[PDB]
A = this chain, B = another copy of it.
Amino acid sequence: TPQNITDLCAEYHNTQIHTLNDKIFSYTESLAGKREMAIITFKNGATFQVEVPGSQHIDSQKKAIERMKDTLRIAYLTEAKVEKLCVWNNKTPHAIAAISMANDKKI
C-alpha cells in the first residue's frame, strides 16, 4: 500500500502529479444527462474533472467518485489549500484520481 499521493500515482499508467499548493479558484457541477461531472480550475488556468461514471470504472470506484465531488465542493467553499492532485492525462480535462491537502507543510 502506498503511504502518499506520489507513490500512489506511480502505480498507474497515464497519470501525473500536479503540485498546486493553492486553493481552488472555481468549482462547477452539472446534472445534465451524460455530463454528470464536476470541473475545477486554479487561478493560473489549470483545469480538472471528476469523470462521469462509466465503463472505465470498476464498482468500488462509484462511491469514491461521489466522495471526491463532495471533497472538492467543501474544499472550494472553505478555501482549503490543495497540495497535489494525481490525475490521468489521457483525458481532457485531466481526470482526478487522488487529492492531498496539507495546509501547514513548508514548501
Contacts and interface: CB of A to CB of B under 8 A. Distances in A.
B99 A28 contact: yes
Range class of the A interface residue count: 35 or more
Nearest to A84: B28
A28 B11 contact: no
Contacts of A64: 29-31, 36
A90 B71 CA distance: 29
A3 B60 contact: no
Nearest to A31: B64
Interface string A25-37: 1111111111111
Given A61-B36, A69-B67, A29 B98 contact: yes
Interface of A: 1-5, 8, 11-12, 25-37, 39, 41, 43, 47, 49-50, 52-53, 57-58, 60-61, 63-69, 71, 73-78, 80, 83, 86, 91-93, 96-102, 104-105
